[PDB]
Input
Amino acid sequence: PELPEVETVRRELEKRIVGQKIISIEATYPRMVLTGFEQLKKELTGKTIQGISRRGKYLIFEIGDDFRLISHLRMEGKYRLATLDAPREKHDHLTMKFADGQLIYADVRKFGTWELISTDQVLPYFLKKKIGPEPTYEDFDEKLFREKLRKSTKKIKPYLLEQTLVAGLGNIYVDEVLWLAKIHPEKETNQLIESSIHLLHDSIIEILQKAIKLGGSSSALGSTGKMQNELQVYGKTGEKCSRCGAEIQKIKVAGRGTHFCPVCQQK
DNA sequence: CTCTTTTTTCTCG
DNA sequence: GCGAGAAACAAAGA
Ligand SMILES: [Zn+2]
Output
């Protein structure tokens, strides 16, 4: 899940569980709660969900007066709202039970994490993570973006994936953004000219905002996505580029699968 | 059987 | 600090 998918899940949860009182919390995989499961169970049982926020790819449950549950879905994390009598599924790990239903977290690879922290510790938590600005015209300043790119010799794709230049890009959208901005994934950032950096900046915002609008790329929150039908290069190996007709190629960059058009994205 | 494929953060040199 | 490689872990395909 990348920013668009996490925002979609955030919106669905905001509309469905806010105001709900947590009756009980159970786990079959307590170790994914990095701050301690039994401690979380004792602290949150009986509290009411006040809201759901997001920072980068991180989900933030606002519970009770001063509690913040930080959830990261990593690669395969999935949330679903089910009936209280719903049967257990093989990869379900945690569940928050409410009066008329339950929120279940499942993760095949077990990479996802939960961390319970205080309201005043949220900003410090993300500062420590070094997460960059949200991908919006208001928060994503092109000037700083440009200066950081000009000082570096890192390849653009790996650098964007660091989450430090801007938050939210994953393997899918980084490939889509670079194709839209006509930049090759291995291009060293200090070689990007002003006009290209400007195109990149806007493309990052446009692609992600479009993905959010379309519910991301897909009983399972955030599965109604339509952005997958708008992808131009990710997983399109062998297919023809919609702009020039050349075949999309796939290579490895810093260990990640990378899709790009050899013509539109000159090395 | 073996090898490869699919977010975050550490290890090694 | 950096790049390269890989671990955390599970499933499916060549
Ligand atoms: Zn092309």
User: Anything to note?
Assistant: The beta strands of chain A are 24-27, 49-55, 58-63, 67-72, 78-82, 92-98, 101-106, 113-118, 249-253, 256-260.
